[PDB]
Amino acid sequence: MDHVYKGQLQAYALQHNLELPVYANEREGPPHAPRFRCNVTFCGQTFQSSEFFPTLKSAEHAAAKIAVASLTPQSPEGIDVAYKNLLQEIAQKESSLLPFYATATSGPSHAPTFTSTVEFAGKVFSGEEAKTKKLAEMSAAKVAFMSIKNGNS
């Protein structure tokens, strides 16, 4: 909604050690026909859409959205595959140690269930229990990651 996009791009420049990003604001158009053309200058490149936005921030958002989407190609993965990758990202960043996925099987011979646990940073979290590994792990990485955030300090 807000310039949240600027906070993302700016973050990349910080880690990549690149000149701070610069946006261009332009407003022109009749009262009932206002147009906000905003451009984003990055690495000597100005990205812009072919359609004008009815709102200012809408332009800045879309402008950066195009830029940040251009960097993705660098190394895409999408956490929509295996949160396992995410857990590995924090491990390297936190200089900790690759998590430890432990799957234990137990329960009645008629309705057998499984339990998955992840030990990272010396802390072991317990995911939900069910007759499925996917959900088990999902609930495990979910509770673990959420715990890491510990809300907004």
Coordinates of N, CA and C in Angstrom, one line a residue:
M1 N 0.9 -1.2 0.0 CA 0.0 0.0 0.0 C 0.9 1.2 0.0
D2 N 1.7 1.4 1.0 CA 2.6 2.5 1.1 C 3.9 2.3 0.3
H3 N 4.9 3.1 0.5 CA 6.2 3.0 -0.2 C 6.9 1.8 0.3
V4 N 6.2 0.9 1.0 CA 6.9 -0.3 1.5 C 7.9 -0.9 0.6
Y5 N 7.6 -0.7 -0.7 CA 8.5 -1.1 -1.8 C 9.9 -0.5 -1.7
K6 N 9.9 0.8 -1.4 CA 11.1 1.6 -1.3 C 12.0 1.0 -0.2
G7 N 11.3 0.6 0.9 CA 12.1 0.0 2.0 C 12.7 -1.3 1.6
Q8 N 12.2 -2.0 0.6 CA 12.7 -3.3 0.2 C 13.9 -3.0 -0.7
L9 N 13.7 -2.2 -1.7 CA 14.8 -1.9 -2.7 C 15.9 -1.2 -1.9
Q10 N 15.6 -0.3 -1.1 CA 16.7 0.4 -0.3 C 17.5 -0.6 0.5
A11 N 16.8 -1.6 1.0 CA 17.5 -2.7 1.8 C 18.5 -3.4 0.9
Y12 N 18.1 -3.7 -0.3 CA 19.1 -4.4 -1.2 C 20.3 -3.6 -1.5
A13 N 20.1 -2.3 -1.8 CA 21.2 -1.4 -2.1 C 22.1 -1.3 -0.9
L14 N 21.6 -1.4 0.3 CA 22.4 -1.4 1.5 C 23.3 -2.6 1.6
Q15 N 22.8 -3.7 1.4 CA 23.5 -5.0 1.4 C 24.4 -5.1 0.2
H16 N 24.0 -4.5 -0.9 CA 24.7 -4.6 -2.1 C 25.7 -3.4 -2.3
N17 N 25.6 -2.5 -1.3 CA 26.5 -1.3 -1.4 C 26.3 -0.6 -2.6
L18 N 25.1 -0.1 -2.9 CA 24.8 0.7 -4.1 C 24.2 2.0 -3.8
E19 N 24.4 3.0 -4.6 CA 23.9 4.3 -4.4 C 22.4 4.3 -4.0
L20 N 22.0 5.0 -3.0 CA 20.6 5.0 -2.6 C 19.7 5.2 -3.8
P21 N 18.5 4.6 -3.8 CA 17.5 4.7 -4.9 C 16.9 6.1 -4.9
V22 N 16.5 6.5 -6.1 CA 15.9 7.8 -6.3 C 14.6 7.7 -7.1
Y23 N 13.5 8.3 -6.6 CA 12.2 8.3 -7.3 C 11.9 9.6 -7.9
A24 N 11.1 9.6 -9.0 CA 10.7 10.9 -9.6 C 9.2 11.0 -9.6
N25 N 8.7 12.2 -9.1 CA 7.3 12.4 -8.9 C 6.8 13.4 -10.0
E26 N 5.7 13.0 -10.6 CA 5.1 13.9 -11.6 C 3.6 13.9 -11.5
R27 N 2.9 15.1 -11.5 CA 1.5 15.1 -11.4 C 0.9 16.1 -12.5
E28 N 0.1 15.5 -13.3 CA -0.5 16.3 -14.4 C -1.8 15.7 -14.9
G29 N -2.9 16.5 -15.0 CA -4.1 15.9 -15.5 C -5.3 16.7 -14.9
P30 N -6.4 16.9 -15.7 CA -7.6 17.7 -15.2 C -8.0 17.2 -13.8
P31 N -8.9 17.9 -13.2 CA -9.4 17.6 -11.9 C -10.0 16.2 -11.8
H32 N -11.0 15.9 -12.7 CA -11.6 14.6 -12.8 C -10.8 13.6 -13.6
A33 N -9.6 14.1 -14.0 CA -8.7 13.2 -14.8 C -7.2 13.4 -14.4
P34 N -6.9 13.1 -13.1 CA -5.6 13.3 -12.6 C -4.7 12.1 -13.0
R35 N -3.4 12.3 -13.2 CA -2.5 11.2 -13.6 C -1.2 11.4 -12.8
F36 N -0.7 10.3 -12.1 CA 0.5 10.4 -11.4 C 1.6 9.5 -12.0
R37 N 2.5 10.1 -12.7 CA 3.6 9.4 -13.4 C 4.8 9.4 -12.5
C38 N 5.2 8.3 -11.9 CA 6.3 8.3 -11.0 C 7.3 7.2 -11.5
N39 N 8.6 7.7 -11.6 CA 9.6 6.8 -12.1 C 10.6 6.4 -11.0
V40 N 11.4 5.3 -11.2 CA 12.3 4.9 -10.2 C 13.7 4.7 -10.8
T41 N 14.7 5.5 -10.3 CA 16.0 5.5 -10.9 C 16.9 4.6 -10.0
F42 N 17.4 3.5 -10.6 CA 18.3 2.6 -9.9 C 19.4 2.1 -10.8
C43 N 20.6 2.1 -10.3 CA 21.8 1.6 -11.1 C 21.8 2.3 -12.5
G44 N 21.4 3.5 -12.5 CA 21.4 4.3 -13.8 C 20.3 3.7 -14.7
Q45 N 19.2 3.3 -14.2 CA 18.1 2.7 -14.9 C 16.8 3.2 -14.4
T46 N 15.9 3.7 -15.3 CA 14.6 4.2 -14.9 C 13.5 3.3 -15.4
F47 N 12.9 2.6 -14.4 CA 11.8 1.7 -14.7 C 10.4 2.4 -14.6
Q48 N 9.5 2.2 -15.5 CA 8.2 2.8 -15.4 C 7.1 1.9 -16.1
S49 N 5.9 2.1 -15.8 CA 4.8 1.3 -16.4 C 4.3 2.0 -17.6
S50 N 3.4 1.4 -18.4 CA 2.8 2.0 -19.6 C 1.5 2.5 -19.3
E51 N 1.0 2.3 -18.0 CA -0.3 2.8 -17.6 C -0.1 3.7 -16.4
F52 N -0.8 4.9 -16.4 CA -0.8 5.8 -15.3 C -1.7 5.4 -14.2
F53 N -1.2 5.6 -13.0 CA -2.0 5.2 -11.8 C -2.8 6.4 -11.3
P54 N -4.0 6.1 -10.7 CA -4.9 7.2 -10.2 C -4.4 7.7 -8.9
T55 N -3.4 7.2 -8.3 CA -2.8 7.6 -7.0 C -1.3 7.8 -7.1
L56 N -0.8 8.6 -6.2 CA 0.6 8.9 -6.2 C 1.4 7.6 -5.8
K57 N 1.2 7.2 -4.5 CA 1.9 6.1 -4.0 C 1.7 4.9 -4.9
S58 N 0.6 4.8 -5.6 CA 0.3 3.7 -6.5 C 1.4 3.6 -7.6
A59 N 1.9 4.8 -8.0 CA 2.9 4.9 -9.0 C 4.3 4.4 -8.4
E60 N 4.6 5.0 -7.2 CA 5.9 4.6 -6.6 C 5.9 3.1 -6.3
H61 N 4.8 2.6 -5.9 CA 4.7 1.1 -5.5 C 4.9 0.3 -6.8
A62 N 4.2 0.7 -7.9 CA 4.3 -0.1 -9.1 C 5.7 0.1 -9.7
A63 N 6.2 1.3 -9.6 CA 7.6 1.6 -10.2 C 8.6 0.7 -9.5
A64 N 8.7 0.7 -8.2 CA 9.6 -0.2 -7.5 C 9.3 -1.7 -7.7
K65 N 8.0 -2.0 -7.7 CA 7.6 -3.4 -7.9 C 8.2 -3.9 -9.2
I66 N 8.3 -3.1 -10.2 CA 8.9 -3.5 -11.4 C 10.4 -3.8 -11.3
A67 N 11.0 -2.9 -10.5 CA 12.5 -3.0 -10.3 C 12.8 -4.2 -9.4
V68 N 12.1 -4.3 -8.3 CA 12.4 -5.5 -7.4 C 12.1 -6.8 -8.1
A69 N 11.2 -6.7 -9.0 CA 10.8 -8.0 -9.7 C 11.8 -8.3 -10.8
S70 N 12.6 -7.3 -11.2 CA 13.7 -7.5 -12.2 C 14.9 -8.2 -11.5
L71 N 15.1 -7.9 -10.2 CA 16.2 -8.5 -9.5 C 16.0 -9.9 -9.1
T72 N 14.7 -10.2 -8.9 CA 14.3 -11.6 -8.5 C 15.1 -12.6 -9.4
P73 N 14.9 -12.5 -10.7 CA 15.5 -13.5 -11.6 C 17.0 -13.9 -11.2
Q74 N 17.6 -13.0 -10.4 CA 18.9 -13.2 -9.9 C 19.0 -14.7 -9.3
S75 N 18.1 -15.0 -8.4 CA 18.1 -16.3 -7.8 C 16.7 -16.6 -7.2
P76 N 15.7 -16.8 -8.0 CA 14.3 -17.0 -7.5 C 14.2 -18.4 -6.8
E77 N 13.1 -18.6 -6.0 CA 12.9 -19.9 -5.4 C 11.5 -20.0 -4.8
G78 N 11.0 -18.9 -4.3 CA 9.7 -18.8 -3.8 C 9.5 -19.8 -2.6
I79 N 9.1 -19.3 -1.5 CA 9.0 -20.1 -0.3 C 7.8 -21.0 -0.4
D80 N 7.2 -21.1 -1.7 CA 6.1 -21.9 -1.9 C 6.5 -23.3 -2.5
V81 N 7.6 -23.8 -1.9 CA 8.1 -25.1 -2.3 C 8.5 -25.9 -1.1
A82 N 9.5 -25.5 -0.3 CA 10.0 -26.2 0.8 C 10.6 -25.2 1.8
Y83 N 9.8 -24.8 2.8 CA 10.2 -23.9 3.9 C 11.6 -24.3 4.3
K84 N 12.0 -25.6 4.0 CA 13.3 -26.1 4.4 C 14.4 -25.1 3.9
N85 N 14.2 -24.6 2.7 CA 15.1 -23.6 2.1 C 15.2 -22.4 3.0
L86 N 14.1 -21.9 3.5 CA 14.1 -20.7 4.4 C 14.9 -21.0 5.6
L87 N 14.6 -22.1 6.3 CA 15.3 -22.5 7.5 C 16.8 -22.5 7.3
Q88 N 17.2 -22.9 6.1 CA 18.7 -22.9 5.7 C 19.2 -21.5 5.5
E89 N 18.3 -20.6 5.1 CA 18.8 -19.2 4.8 C 19.2 -18.5 6.2
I90 N 18.3 -18.7 7.2 CA 18.6 -18.1 8.5 C 19.8 -18.7 9.1
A91 N 20.0 -20.0 8.9 CA 21.1 -20.8 9.5 C 22.4 -20.1 9.0
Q92 N 22.5 -19.9 7.7 CA 23.8 -19.3 7.2 C 23.9 -17.8 7.7
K93 N 22.8 -17.1 7.6 CA 22.8 -15.7 8.0 C 23.1 -15.6 9.5
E94 N 22.4 -16.3 10.3 CA 22.7 -16.3 11.7 C 24.0 -17.1 12.1
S95 N 24.6 -17.6 11.0 CA 25.9 -18.3 11.2 C 25.7 -19.4 12.2
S96 N 24.5 -19.9 12.4 CA 24.2 -21.0 13.3 C 24.6 -22.3 12.7
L97 N 23.7 -23.3 12.7 CA 24.0 -24.6 12.2 C 22.8 -25.2 11.5
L98 N 23.0 -25.8 10.3 CA 21.9 -26.4 9.6 C 20.9 -27.1 10.5
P99 N 19.6 -26.8 10.5 CA 18.6 -27.4 11.3 C 18.7 -28.9 11.3
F100 N 17.9 -29.5 12.1 CA 17.9 -31.0 12.2 C 16.4 -31.5 12.1
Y101 N 16.1 -32.1 11.0 CA 14.7 -32.6 10.8 C 14.6 -34.0 11.3
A102 N 13.8 -34.2 12.4 CA 13.6 -35.5 13.0 C 12.2 -35.9 12.9
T103 N 11.9 -37.0 12.1 CA 10.6 -37.5 12.0 C 10.4 -38.8 12.7
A104 N 9.5 -38.7 13.7 CA 9.2 -39.9 14.5 C 7.8 -40.5 14.2
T105 N 7.7 -41.8 14.0 CA 6.4 -42.4 13.7 C 5.9 -43.2 14.9
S106 N 4.6 -43.0 15.2 CA 4.0 -43.6 16.3 C 2.5 -43.5 16.2
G107 N 1.8 -44.3 17.0 CA 0.3 -44.3 17.0 C -0.2 -45.7 16.8
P108 N -1.5 -45.9 16.7 CA -2.2 -47.2 16.5 C -1.9 -47.7 15.1
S109 N -1.9 -49.1 15.0 CA -1.7 -49.7 13.7 C -2.7 -49.4 12.7
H110 N -3.9 -48.9 13.2 CA -5.0 -48.5 12.4 C -4.9 -47.1 11.9
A111 N -4.5 -46.2 12.9 CA -4.4 -44.8 12.6 C -3.0 -44.3 13.0
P112 N -2.0 -44.6 12.2 CA -0.6 -44.2 12.5 C -0.3 -42.8 12.2
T113 N 0.4 -42.0 13.1 CA 0.7 -40.6 12.8 C 2.2 -40.4 12.9
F114 N 2.6 -39.2 12.6 CA 4.1 -38.9 12.6 C 4.3 -37.5 13.3
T115 N 5.5 -37.3 13.8 CA 5.8 -36.0 14.4 C 7.2 -35.6 13.9
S116 N 7.2 -34.3 13.5 CA 8.5 -33.7 12.9 C 9.0 -32.6 13.9
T117 N 10.3 -32.6 14.1 CA 10.9 -31.6 14.9 C 12.1 -31.0 14.2
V118 N 12.3 -29.7 14.5 CA 13.4 -28.9 13.9 C 14.3 -28.3 14.9
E119 N 15.6 -28.7 15.0 CA 16.5 -28.1 16.0 C 17.5 -27.2 15.3
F120 N 17.3 -25.9 15.5 CA 18.1 -24.9 14.9 C 18.5 -23.8 15.9
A121 N 19.8 -23.5 16.1 CA 20.2 -22.5 17.0 C 20.2 -23.1 18.5
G122 N 20.1 -24.4 18.6 CA 20.1 -25.0 19.9 C 18.7 -25.2 20.4
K123 N 17.7 -24.6 19.7 CA 16.3 -24.7 20.1 C 15.6 -25.7 19.2
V124 N 14.8 -26.5 19.8 CA 14.0 -27.5 19.1 C 12.5 -27.2 19.2
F125 N 11.8 -27.0 18.1 CA 10.4 -26.7 18.0 C 9.7 -28.0 17.6
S126 N 8.4 -28.1 18.1 CA 7.6 -29.2 17.7 C 6.4 -28.8 16.9
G127 N 6.2 -29.4 15.7 CA 5.1 -29.1 14.8 C 3.9 -29.8 15.2
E128 N 2.8 -29.7 14.5 CA 1.5 -30.3 14.8 C 1.7 -31.8 14.4
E129 N 0.7 -32.6 14.9 CA 0.7 -34.1 14.7 C -0.4 -34.4 13.7
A130 N -0.1 -35.3 12.8 CA -1.1 -35.7 11.8 C -0.6 -36.9 11.0
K131 N -1.5 -37.6 10.2 CA -1.1 -38.7 9.4 C -0.5 -38.2 8.1
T132 N 0.3 -37.1 8.2 CA 1.0 -36.6 7.0 C 2.3 -35.9 7.4
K133 N 3.3 -36.0 6.6 CA 4.6 -35.4 6.8 C 4.6 -33.9 6.4
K134 N 4.0 -33.6 5.3 CA 3.9 -32.3 4.8 C 3.4 -31.3 5.8
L135 N 2.2 -31.6 6.3 CA 1.6 -30.7 7.3 C 2.4 -30.7 8.6
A136 N 2.9 -31.8 9.0 CA 3.7 -31.9 10.2 C 4.9 -30.9 10.1
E137 N 5.7 -31.0 9.0 CA 6.8 -30.1 8.8 C 6.3 -28.7 8.7
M138 N 5.2 -28.5 7.9 CA 4.7 -27.1 7.8 C 4.4 -26.5 9.1
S139 N 3.8 -27.2 10.0 CA 3.4 -26.7 11.3 C 4.7 -26.5 12.1
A140 N 5.7 -27.3 11.8 CA 7.0 -27.2 12.6 C 7.7 -25.9 12.2
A141 N 7.9 -25.7 10.9 CA 8.6 -24.5 10.4 C 7.8 -23.3 10.7
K142 N 6.5 -23.4 10.8 CA 5.6 -22.3 11.1 C 5.8 -21.8 12.5
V143 N 5.7 -22.7 13.4 CA 5.9 -22.3 14.8 C 7.3 -21.8 15.1
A144 N 8.3 -22.4 14.4 CA 9.7 -22.1 14.7 C 9.9 -20.7 14.1
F145 N 9.6 -20.4 12.9 CA 9.8 -19.1 12.3 C 9.1 -18.0 13.1
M146 N 7.8 -18.3 13.4 CA 7.0 -17.3 14.1 C 7.7 -17.0 15.5
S147 N 8.3 -18.0 16.1 CA 9.0 -17.8 17.4 C 10.2 -16.9 17.2
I148 N 10.9 -17.1 16.1 CA 12.1 -16.3 15.8 C 11.8 -14.8 15.7
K149 N 10.7 -14.5 15.1 CA 10.3 -13.1 15.0 C 10.0 -12.4 16.4
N150 N 9.4 -13.2 17.2 CA 9.1 -12.7 18.6 C 8.3 -11.4 18.5
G151 N 7.5 -11.2 17.5 CA 6.8 -10.0 17.3 C 7.7 -8.8 17.0
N152 N 7.1 -7.6 17.0 CA 7.9 -6.4 16.7 C 8.5 -5.9 18.0
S153 N 9.8 -5.9 18.1 CA 10.5 -5.4 19.3 C 10.5 -3.9 19.4

